[PDB]
């Protein structure tokens, strides 16, 4: 099976920004769409953008969609999500997923938290 490890949550002041990645291995990085998701603590988590196999095709919630930016490097098993214009309500865990078909995501990470001060 496929283990994704995220990195890169932390702190930031509101307008900043974080990079998440998130590393992937056991199989071959390639054959799968990566994607980000998100859980805020008072709500359910919701998806945030997704990659395509080669890294061209891109899909953005309409939230975050010209302030973050996915992107891959399948020499690196990483998948990457630049996040811009940080806003407070970007606050949240966020997971990285993994699956062979372009919500329902077969493999998951253990999540990394962004906090976004006011």
């Known amino acids: 099976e496929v283990q994704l490890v995220e990195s890169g949550g932390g702190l930031v002041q509101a307008g900043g920004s974080l990079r998440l990645s998130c590393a992937a291995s056991?199989?071959?990085?390639?054959?799968?769409?990566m994607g980000w998701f998100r859980q805020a603590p008072g709500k359910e988590r919701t998806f945030v953008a997704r990659?395509?196999?080669?890294?061209?095709?891109?899909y953005y919630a309409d939230s975050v969609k010209g302030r973050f930016t996915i992107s891959r490097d399948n020499a690196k098993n990483t998948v990457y999500l630049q996040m811009n214009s940080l806003k407070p309500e970007d606050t949240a865990i966020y997971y990285c997923?993994?699956?062979?078909?372009w919500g329902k995501f077969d493999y998951w990470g253990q999540g990394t938290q962004v906090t976004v001060s006011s």
């Open positions: 990659i395509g196999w080669s890294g061209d095709l891109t």
């Open positions: 997923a993994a699956d062979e078909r």
């Open positions: 056991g199989r071959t990085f390639s054959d799968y769409v």
